[PDB]
Amino acid sequence: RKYFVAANWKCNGTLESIKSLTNSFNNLDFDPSKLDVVVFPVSVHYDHTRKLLQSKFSTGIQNVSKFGNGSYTGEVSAEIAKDLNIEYVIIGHFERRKYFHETDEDVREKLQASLKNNLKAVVCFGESLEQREQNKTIEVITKQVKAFVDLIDNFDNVILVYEPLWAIGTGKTATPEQAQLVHKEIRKIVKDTCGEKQANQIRILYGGSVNTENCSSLIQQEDIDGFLVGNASLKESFVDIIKSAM
Amino acid sequence: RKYFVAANWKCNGTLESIKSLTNSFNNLDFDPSKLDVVVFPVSVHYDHTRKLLQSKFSTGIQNVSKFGNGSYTGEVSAEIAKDLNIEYVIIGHFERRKYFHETDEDVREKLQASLKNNLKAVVCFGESLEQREQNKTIEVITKQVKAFVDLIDNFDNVILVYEPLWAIGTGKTATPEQAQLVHKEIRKIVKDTCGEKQANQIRILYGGSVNTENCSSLIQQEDIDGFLVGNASLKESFVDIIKSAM
Question: What span, in angstroms and rounded, lies between the C-alpha atoms of A161 and A230?
Fold first, then answer.
């Protein structure tokens, strides 16, 4: 199983700051055949980011439309992304669920669109603090995964992300034990719906306050296959988070 | 009043089709000081489109964020647009109101963010068939315009678009006289809220299946200052629509 370190830049960056950050990223020597390292810039920053990044870095966009080509103002379809050779897409991110009415149904329609246009999908899910405190974590996770999991045909092409909503941008990282326990359950859901071989090859990443100090102990866990990094991926020390997966 | 013809490509285009479309667009000789011609490609096509089109053509994006920079995955902020020197933005388009929960509040906050970052805004609104059949057109138009109109500090930099919802992508073009009556009322709404000189300065465009056949009859109305064009702007014959406003 190949590790997967993703940089979700979110709504951040200038042409110059990206030039500077992309320069520090390029200095890191890593084998792209052994490790996947993906950068997700803002849509309008993509060409600039792709030009500057060495080919060892994979690239993608932070959102993809549930609709194909047509009368949908403001949307980036899956077929448009494929034409531009954009390899990866993020689907079901907490912030889009929270601020932009993105539901479990939107998630699967985005996945189905991405898969039939041969795009690789990074699919996000996680429970809130209330759901955690009500002991509903697995119930919520199972519900969120089952929404889309049947669509997966190639299990190298779909990458799952457990992002506990209370851990995102708060500094309250889930302990490598807490993350591992949910990751192990996620892999069990994939096993019982898709098969053991399909479960053993799918990457399940952790998202939620990954930094340079906690990344090593997180990646060491048997069912954690990498990270979706937010704030720390905006920093030059993001190379050290990639180093933890080497 | 300087006429304004806008191409809304929506969720359409490949690299090769844009190359072919921009090449035919570039052949049309027009004076950008006499007429504003703006094209709005998909966010991921922006750099490609901007490079291909000659400097006489203005460009913009189909949507801007209500949020500034920060943890908002999938968003394009007004600060980011400013840094790319993206001149124009579309706000409040019917499709984003219909499919993506965009409200009058979102429209207000997007316009405020755009003007703060020195972007020019193409702001869309319009009544549905049911609202028109209930004779609520003036009431709905007034409510939609009043949601944002007080934010306008420069009346060359904000451009209004009347989108009768039943006319969008349907071939149900509102008759020149029907459109004129609304445009005239929109100008009066801008008169009572912003002043007379500002009302006579602001551009109000028609949006609703404009083509090469109906464009000249629409542009000839005294209160219609141009168009936001959908599907017809994906054709090489879009140059003839520009010609009717020359």
Answer: 13
